[PDB]
Structure formats: C-alpha cells, structure tokens
C-alpha cells in the first residue's frame, strides 16, 4: 500500500490570511501531502468562520495542487470551503454535529473524515468537562456513559456511518479518526493507539491525530524530559514524542497522520515505511 500521508495543521486565528499562507508554504516545503485548514472560534459565527478559511484555501490553491481538508463540523462552512477548492471535510463531530453535513459531503463527491467524538458521546465524563459543546444528537447517552471505550467508538461510528449511507456518501470516500486526545483518559488513549489495527479491520482508511497530545506530554514529564513549549528543548521534545507515535502508526499502515510539525513526522514516516514496505 502507499506510505502514510502527512497532513499539516493550519489554524486560522480570529494578516491572518498571510500568516496561514506562510505556514501553508512552510508545511508544503517540509513534505505535507495534505493541509487541514481550520477556522473555528449562529449565522454570524458561520460567516466569520467562512471568511477565515475561504481566503486561505483560494490562496493555497493558486500555487499548489496539495490536498486540502476543511476542518469544520458546520455544513455551511464545508460547502463554502469545498466550492473554494477543498478536497475533503475533516469533521470532528463525525457527521453528528450537523444533520446537513452528509448531504454537503455527498453533493460535492468529497471525502470525509468521521471522527469519534467522546466529548459528545460522554458530556458529563470527567475528561470531557473542559471541552466546548460541539454540534447543532444522541437520545437519553445513559448507555454510552458506561460502555468500554472500544464498544463506545463502534456505537458512535455505527450512527455516523448510517448518516453517511442515507446521504449517499460512497463508502470509499470515508476515513475514520479514533478521536485521540478528545475527552479520553490516559488508558483509553493508549488502548485506542494499541488497537489501531482493530479500527483498520472495519475496512476504512485511518486519519490519525498524533500531535502535541496531553497524555504523551505527561509520559515525557513523568520520565524526566523537559516539556515547556516556551523553551526550545520542550518544544522539540514534544514534537519528537509525537513523531515516535507516527513511527508506530506508519509501520502499521495508518493512511494519514494529522500533525503540527511536518518535518519531524517526515522522518518517522520515511523510516517506518521503509521497514513496512521492505519486500
């Protein structure tokens, strides 16, 4: 199969155009094969989000054929971004935050990343408390509160995939993201990483968030590594640590990794893929 694709993160802060565009050039030059453009954070909110992402996507498209993902759970943002040149929707709510999102994805013949969102699945969970509310979902959740994380992920994807099917999104256009670092305990995050192959066995490509995750940073700090991101050494250690997770992921055929620091993950991908693809 093909080596792991590296998807670089571009967050457009609410001049912003030019900074996003600078980072786009940087990540492309470091070997990103995809860019994930995000503008998050009512009609006023949607319009402001559109005005962040659409300029950037048009600008990037003029000088690059790179695959562009629009990172939004809002159908209106996705529709506008796809029209402007984005190739796929990265939906952190996995089609559960907006009932219109499946139709938008289908009509555009676009690809979609369906993220498992444990925050929406377990709103009262201790790890989810500090997160915002995603979405414009689930009935009276009681069951979800109890379920072992892998069972809950399956339950969530069953619902999300049903939504994709009644919209007519082709199965081959769907990627799954297990939602690492989104309202999960340390053990759960590690279990989901351990069991990436089980997720892959479902038959969809995996889009994996490996970058600057709190549980990984906690492994470093408890083992004596500097982790302060306002130091050169801490900043570096954080990215190297994420790149170790990419090494593992790429070796087992994960199709896409979503990352901040493309260069460090390129090292990991090239090593890991050379091994995986030895014969």
Contacts of residue 137, defined as CB under 8 A and 6 or more positions apart, other chains included, come to: 96, 97, 120
Distances (CA, A) of 64 to 24, 84, 269: 10, 13, 22
The answer to whether 19 touches 29, Cβ cutoff 8 Å, is no
Is 65 annotated in a binding site? The answer is no
The residue length of the chain stands at 279
The answer to whether 70 touches 81, Cβ cutoff 8 Å, is yes
Contacts of residue 263, defined as CB under 8 A and 6 or more positions apart, other chains included, come to: 30, 31
For residue 258, count CB atoms less than 10 angstroms from its CB and return exposed for 0-12, middle for 13-18, buried for 19 or more: buried
The answer to whether 41 touches 66, Cβ cutoff 8 Å, is no
Exposure on the CB side of residue 103, measured as CA atoms within 13 A: 6
Other beta carbons within 10 Å of 92: 24
CA 254 to chain centre: 13
Is 159 annotated in a binding site? The answer is no
Other beta carbons within 10 Å of 40: 18
Is 11 annotated in a binding site? The answer is yes
Compute the distance between CA of residue 97 and CA of residue 91 in angstroms, rounded to an integer. 9
At 100 the three-state DSSP class reads: coil
Compute the distance between CA of residue 256 and CA of residue 3 in angstroms, rounded to an integer. 9
CA angle 54, 60, 62 (to 5 degrees): 105
Is 260 annotated in a binding site? The answer is yes
Fold of 1-279: TIM Barrel (3.20.20)
Resolution in A: 1.8
Exposure on the CB side of residue 95, measured as CA atoms within 13 A: 26
Is 266 annotated in a binding site? The answer is no
Record the tokens describing residue 80, joined without a space: 């506008």
Q: Where are the domains of the chain?
A: 1-279
The answer to whether 112 touches 78, Cβ cutoff 8 Å, is no
Is 189 annotated in a binding site? The answer is no
Compute the distance between CA of residue 152 and CA of residue 129 in angstroms, rounded to an integer. 18
Is 177 annotated in a binding site? The answer is yes
Compute the distance between CA of residue 55 and CA of residue 16 in angstroms, rounded to an integer. 10
CA-based nearest residue to 87, from 57, 63, 62, 116: 57
Is 258 annotated in a binding site? The answer is yes
Compute the distance between CA of residue 41 and CA of residue 61 in angstroms, rounded to an integer. 24
Dihedral sign for Cα atoms in the order 138, 139, 142, 148: negative
């Amino acid at each position: 199969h093909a080596k792991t694709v590296i998807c670089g993160i571009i967050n457009v802060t609410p001049f912003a155009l030019e900074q996003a565009l600078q980072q786009a050039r940087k990540l492309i030059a470091e070997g990103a094969s995809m860019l994930d453009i995000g503008g998050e954070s009512s009609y006023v909110e949607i319009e402001e989000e559109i005005q962040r992402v659409v300029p950037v996507i048009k600008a990037i498209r003029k000088e690059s054929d790179v695959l562009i993902s629009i990172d939004t759970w809002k159908s209106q943002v996705a529709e506008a971004a796809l029209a402007a040149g984005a190739d796929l929707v990265n939906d952190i709510t996995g089609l559960m935050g907006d009932e219109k999102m499946p139709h938008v994805v289908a009509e555009a013949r676009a690809q979609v990343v369906i993220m498992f969102n444990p925050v929406m699945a377990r709103p009262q969970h201790p790890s989810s408390l500090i997160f915002p509310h995603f979405g414009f979902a689930f009935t009276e959740l009681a069951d979800f509160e109890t379920l072992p994380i892998e069972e809950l992920m399956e339950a969530f994807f069953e619902r999300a995939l049903a939504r994709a099917a009644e919209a007519g999104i082709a199965p081959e256009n769907i990627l799954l993201d297990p939602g690492i670092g989104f309202g999960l305990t340390k053990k759960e995050n590690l279990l989901l990483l351990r069991d990436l192959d089980k997720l892959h066995q479902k038959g969809y490509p995996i889009f994996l968030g490996v970058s600057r995750k709190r549980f990984v940073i906690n492994i470093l700090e408890e083992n004596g590594f500097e982790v302060n991101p306002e130091t050169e050494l801490g900043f570096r250690n954080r990215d190297t640590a994420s790149a170790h997770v990419t090494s593992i992921a790429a070796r087992q055929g994960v199709e896409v990794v979503r990352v901040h620091d493309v260069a460090s993950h390129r090292m990991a991908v090239e090593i890991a893929s050379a091994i995986r693809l030895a014969d």
